[PDB]
């Protein structure tokens, strides 16, 4: 019935929410704007994007945010007639500190205009809101320990949230320290039968990842741990195509069934490599998957052992499928950018990105370079398949090497490749390749660049991704294409390749314009094509 992952490409930190017979997953968006994606389903198999809640600077201001900063795992719940969304803005992602803030916004409907944030606390990420039977509300999050002699993951902190006062009240208490896996995060609370169940993520979001669960009769513990913990992990299953299984959330359907959504990474093919030495590279980042649960002696169990199954049986409901929500060839005739497109850190106004200046075109006025955490004229969508083609057609007339426009495959400010139009003193208007690998830049077509003929209005730019490797090609007519003589490697656009380990996103493909002279020179993109192959 259901083949995993249900949300492919960059979809980490899934939070699942039942409202009667409708089902929602919110996922993390990190430095990508707007913040948070929410998908809806009737059958837990087919999913459509229904909301992008954090779209006002008053809710989310990420200017200058570090790569993999911003919106970490969000938490979606529904109570007292409305949806409650908890989210982070993480400012510091390397070193002894992890400075970041937790906020609450609400809405009566999933896709309405959500409130402005209520500040909660800053003590650690992965905040979650629990709505207890007695009407009381409680916030759980991880508690961060910066000290040199200590492990940073101090445990799970709980504090009561007063709806009326719009603040946490009483005193914060640590209710759980974790198991020896440590790196205890992603807390979620569930009242099931006579117990409070505390779900956590442990072992860290790489290959040691796990979901741990514990129970207590008191909300403040002590929590006894599942006798066969972890509840879920891929660590002991180095051949399982789904790796890094953890950061889960429990759903109890109206049909009286139990399911567990979680993140996972799907490494590239590794045949010929030591099984255990390095466990793989995931260009699609961390994706969302689902597992069935069954109950024994008051403990849930992942059906089919504690590793993730590639295929599961969905709940006992009618299949409800959805119509495709993007054009394979986006001609840019719409009056609002398709909802699979996102921007870096900030909203781009009409002065930077516009469908109005030239109907049928996305116009990007040139801003800062691909290494800037501030203002980039860059519109991009997720790699969502191992095998795909992406294509654009652009008119751009640069007058200086400081200006560029092109097709970009992008992980972060220091890790990307592009096929771009720029200008050269002797050759004039040119096509080139450019890579950035940990801030180190290469120009592979150095002194060998494609001269673009004066009479050519539109350059056609394409990338063809074939799992491990990909290639850029170009055309001056849309019919006759020419390969550029460089093979690129997808593993360099993956979480696992990044040396900082603040690497929580996934690969994007998009359209970029830079004008480092500040002459407000723009590029006109006639269309954007993305097609699974």
Supply 80's token pair: 């007292």
CB of 274 to its own copies, least distance (A): 4
338, 468, 473, 519: which one contacts its own copies (CB under 8 A)? 519
Asked if residue 331 binds Ca ion (CB under 5 A), the reply is yes
Asked if residue 412 binds its own copies (CB under 8 A), the reply is no
With contacts defined by CB under 5 A, name the span among 64-72, 201-209, 313-321, 353-361 that binds Ca ion. Answer: 353-361
What ranges make up the beta strands (E) of 241-396? 243-252, 258-265, 286-296, 299-302, 311-312, 329-330, 343-344, 353-354, 362-365, 377-382, 387-395
- Tally of helices (H runs) and strands (E runs) in the chain: 0, 41
For residue 466, count other CB atoms closer than 10 A to its CB: 14
43, 160, 202, 526: which one contacts Ca ion (CB under 5 A)? 526
| Residues 356-395, mask of contacts with its own copies (x by CB under 8 A) | ------------xx-xxxxx--------------------
Q: Are the beta carbons of 193 and 298 closer than 8 angstroms?
A: yes
Instruction: Give the torsion sign (CA, 60, 62, 65, 67).
Output: positive
Q: Helix (H, G, I), strand (E, B), or coil: what is residue 427?
A: coil
Binding at 136: pick from Ca ion, its own copies, none (beta carbon under 5-8 Å per type):
none
22, 111, 132, 145: which one contacts its own copies (CB under 8 A)? 145
Binding at 304: pick from its own copies, Ca ion, none (beta carbon under 5-8 Å per type):
none
With contacts defined by CB under 8 A, name the span among 80-88, 191-199, 271-279, 473-481 that binds its own copies. Answer: 271-279
Q: Are the beta carbons of 88 and 70 closer than 8 angstroms?
A: yes
CB of 325 to its own copies, least distance (A): 33
Q: Are the beta carbons of 281 and 267 closer than 8 angstroms?
A: yes
With contacts defined by CB under 8 A, name the span among 27-35, 90-98, 186-194, 476-484 that binds its own copies. Answer: 90-98
How many whole angstroms separate alpha carbon 502 and alpha carbon 487?
27
Asked if residue 273 binds its own copies (CB under 8 A), the reply is yes
Binding at 526: pick from its own copies, Ca ion, none (beta carbon under 5-8 Å per type):
Ca ion
Asked if residue 89 binds Ca ion (CB under 5 A), the reply is no
Tell me the site size for its own copies, rule CB under 8 A: 65
CA atoms within 13 A on the CB side of 471: 10
Supply 340's token pair: 């699979």
Asked if residue 447 binds its own copies (CB under 8 A), the reply is yes
How many whole angstroms separate alpha carbon 517 and alpha carbon 368?
10
Binding at 56: pick from Ca ion, its own copies, none (beta carbon under 5-8 Å per type):
none
Tell me the site size for Ca ion, rule CB under 5 A: 5
| Residues 105-144, mask of contacts with its own copies (x by CB under 8 A) | --------------xxxxx--------------------x
Exposed / middle / buried, residue 458 (Cβ in 10 Å: 0-12, 13-18, 19+): middle
Exposed / middle / buried, residue 366 (Cβ in 10 Å: 0-12, 13-18, 19+): buried
Question: At which residue do the structure tokens 């400075």 appear?
Answer: 99
Question: At which residue do the structure tokens 């450019």 appear?
Answer: 434
Binding at 39: pick from Ca ion, its own copies, none (beta carbon under 5-8 Å per type):
none
Instruction: Give the torsion sign (CA, 139, 140, 141, 145).
Output: positive
Q: What is the DSSP string of 86-121?
A: EEEEE---SSS---EEEEEEEESSTTS-PPPPEEEE
CB nearer to Ca ion: give 332 or 508.
Answer: 332
Binding at 208: pick from Ca ion, its own copies, none (beta carbon under 5-8 Å per type):
its own copies
Rg for the chain (alpha carbons), in Å? 24
Asked if residue 71 binds its own copies (CB under 8 A), the reply is no
CB of 331 to Ca ion, least distance (A): 4
Binding at 359: pick from Ca ion, its own copies, none (beta carbon under 5-8 Å per type):
none
CB nearer to its own copies: give 258 or 410.
Answer: 410
Which residue ranges make up the site for its own copies (CB under 8 A)? 63-65, 91-92, 94-97, 99, 101-102, 119-123, 144-151, 172, 179-183, 203-204, 208, 235-236, 239, 272-277, 368-369, 371-375, 401-402, 414, 436, 439, 441-443, 446-447, 515-519
Which residue ranges make up the site for Ca ion (CB under 5 A)? 331-332, 360, 526-527
């Amino acid at each position: 019935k259901i083949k995993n992952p249900i949300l492919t490409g960059f979809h980490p930190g899934p939070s699942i929410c039942r409202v009667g017979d409708d089902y929602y997953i919110a996922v993390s968006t990190f430095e990508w704007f707007p913040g948070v994606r929410i998908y809806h389903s009737k059958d837990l198999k087919n999913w459509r994007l229904v909301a992008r809640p954090l779209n006002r600077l008053s809710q989310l201001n990420m200017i200058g945010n570090p790569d993999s900063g911003g919106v970490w795992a969000p938490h979606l719940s529904y109570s007292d007639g409305k949806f409650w969304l908890i989210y982070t803005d993480v400012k510091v992602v390397e070193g002894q500190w992890k400075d970041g803030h937790n906020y609450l916004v609400t809405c009566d409907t999933i896709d309405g205009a959500w409130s402005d944030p209520i500040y909660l606390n800053s003590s650690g990420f992965d905040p979650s809101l629990f709505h207890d039977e007695d009407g009381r509300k409680y916030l759980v999050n991880m508690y961060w320990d910066h000290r040199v002699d200590h492990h940073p993951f101090y445990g799970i902190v709980l504090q009561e949230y007063s709806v009326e006062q719009k603040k946490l009240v009483g005193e914060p208490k640590i209710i759980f320290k974790g198991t020896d896996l440590r790196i205890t995060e992603g807390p979620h609370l569930y009242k099931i039968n006579g117990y409070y169940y505390l779900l956590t993520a442990e072992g860290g979001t790489r290959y040691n990842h796990a979901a741990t669960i514990a129970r207590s009769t008191s909300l403040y513990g002590p929590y006894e741990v599942h006798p066969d913990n972890p509840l879920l992990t891929s660590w002991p299953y180095p051949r399982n195509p789904l790796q890094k299984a953890g950061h889960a959330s429990i759903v109890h359907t109206h049909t009286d069934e139990w399911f567990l959504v979680h993140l996972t990474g799907r490494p590239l093919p590794r045949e010929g490599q030591p099984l255990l030495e390095h466990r793989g590279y995931c260009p699609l980042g961390r994706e969302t998957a689902i597992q069935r649960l069954e109950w024994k002696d008051g403990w849930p169990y992942v059906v089919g052992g504690n590793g993730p199954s590639l295929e599961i049986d969905g709940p006992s409901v009618e299949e409800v499928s959805w119509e495709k929500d993007y054009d394979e060839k986006d001609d840019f005739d719409g009056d609002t950018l398709n909802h699979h497109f996102q921007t870096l850190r900030i909203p781009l106004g009409e002065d930077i990105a516009t469908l109005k200046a030239r109907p049928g075109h996305l116009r990007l006025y040139g801003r800062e370079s691909l290494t800037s955490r501030f203002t980039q004229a860059f519109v991009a969508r997720r790699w969502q398949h191992f095998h795909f083609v992406a294509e654009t057609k652009v008119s751009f007339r640069p007058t200086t090497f400081q200006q560029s426009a092109g097709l970009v495959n992008y992980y972060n400010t220091q890790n990307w490749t592009t096929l771009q139009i720029t200008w050269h003193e002797e050759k004039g208007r040119i096509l080139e390749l450019m890579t950035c690998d940990h801030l180190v830049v290469d120009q592979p077509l150095r002194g060998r660049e494609i001269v673009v003929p004066d009479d050519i209005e539109y350059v056609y730019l394409r990338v063809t991704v074939q799992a491990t490797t990909y290639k850029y090609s170009y055309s001056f007519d849309g019919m006759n294409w020419i390969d550029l003589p460089v093979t690129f490697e997808s593993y360099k656009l993956s979480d696992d390749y990044i040396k900082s380990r603040a690497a929580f996103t996934g690969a994007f493909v998009g359209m970029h314009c830079r004008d480092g002279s500040g002459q407000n020179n723009y590029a006109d993109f006639d269309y954007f094509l993305y097609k699974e192959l």
